[PDB]
Amino acid sequence: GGGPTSSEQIMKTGALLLQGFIQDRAGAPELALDPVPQDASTKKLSESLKRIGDELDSNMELQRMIAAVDTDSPREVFFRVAADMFSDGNFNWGRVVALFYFASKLVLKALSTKVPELIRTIMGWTLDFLRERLLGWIQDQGGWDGLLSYFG
Amino acid sequence: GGGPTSSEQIMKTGALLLQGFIQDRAGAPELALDPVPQDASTKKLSESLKRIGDELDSNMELQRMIAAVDTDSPREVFFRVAADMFSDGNFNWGRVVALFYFASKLVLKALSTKVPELIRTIMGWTLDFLRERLLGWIQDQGGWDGLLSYFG
Amino acid sequence: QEDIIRNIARHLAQVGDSMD
Amino acid sequence: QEDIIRNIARHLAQVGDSMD
């Protein structure tokens, strides 16, 4: 059992902070995300992250720039940005924080494409059932103008 | 020499209206476009087109939808939209007008990608000249911090 | 993308039809 | 695209650096 400096603890706490951060920015009861367990100190860290996330969300030019990348291949995008961010060989906490922020934006960009395809998939089932099982009855109503009548 | 109904006149007037319409929506003296020659009647038509172009520019949801298409292959996009617009086999002047409007938006979308690449091309020349001819002198100044000094 | 393109066309067709 | 990605990274690096 290592302290804060052990890689074990760094990866463990890193995953907790990151997940809590991305979930908080991802927020309909069906879409409720379970809280990440956090001791006091990790909690304070998450609070800090969330405030910085909110200020960064206010920079409209950053938001414009982020939305302009094509995330057809988001993994490629993620590793290019990360590599570039740290290419000069310098490190600071700001950059680590901004990297976490970029990861959360990639989740939301991925969803922006996943949700319409999810919708398309379920429409496929629904319309397929409608066509083979309900269309005959719907025709007897004179099509969807019948539903107009029904609703008055 | 056919009248208004001849295909000759239809294509000729069509090209004049279209070009005048797209140019007007494309508007720095270097970027000044020469007016299309128009008799009175074609002029009135162009006026009408320009007013409709302005109302359509005000529909933000249409603008959002247009900017969301990927014009990596704009010709493909153009013919898909056109085909779809007239797929039901109906015609009216509104649709012809809206098609002209879409063509003008495609010009602006193409430019949105052409301009940064034009910039990149000229930067290539400039930086290439800078690197081989000016860098030695710029180094003697201590790099671009020298220009800071120069400007005070 | 193919659905985005379809959406634009049908809005244009609708704009055009609503011009009458 | 490759230049859009570069632009984001360098703005993020700058945000990060300006946090100090």
Numbering used by the authors:
A (entry chain A), B (entry chain A): 10 to 36, 42 to 166
C (entry chain B), D (entry chain B): 79 to 98
Provide passages from the article that reported this PDB entry.
The intrinsic pathway to apoptosis is regulated by interactions between members of three factions of the Bcl-2 protein family: the BH3-only proteins such as Bim and Bid, which initiate the process, the essential effectors Bax and Bak, and the prosurvival members, which oppose the action of both other factions. Unlike Bak, which is constitutively anchored in the mitochondrial outer membrane (MOM) via its C-terminal segment, Bax is largely cytosolic in healthy cells and accumulates at the MOM only upon a death signal. Core/latch dimers of Bax and Bak form on treatment of the monomeric proteins with certain BH3 peptides and CHAPS, and Bax and Bak core domains form symmetric homodimers, supporting that unlatching the core domain is a necessary step to Bax and Bak oligomerisation and permeabilisation of the MOM. Bim and Bid are both potent direct activators of Bax, but Bim is less dependent on interactions via its ‘h0' residues than is Bid.
We previously showed that mini-BH3 motifs, 20-mers spanning residues ‘h0'–‘h4', sufficed to trigger dissociation of BaxΔC into core and latch domains. To confirm that the N- and C-terminal segments of the longer peptides did not influence the peptides' interaction with Bax, we crystallised both BimBH3mini and BidBH3mini with BaxΔC26. These structures are essentially identical to that reported above and to BidBH3:BaxΔC21 (PDB 4BD27), except to note that in the case of the BimBH3mini complex, no clear density is evident for F159 (the ‘h4' residue). The BH3mini:BaxΔC26 complexes contain a cavity between helices α1, α2, α5 and α8 (shaped with the side chains of residues 26, 30, 60, 63, 66, 67, 110, 111, 114, 115, 158 and 161) as observed also in the BidBH3:BaxΔC21 complex but not in the apo BaxΔC21 core/latch dimer.
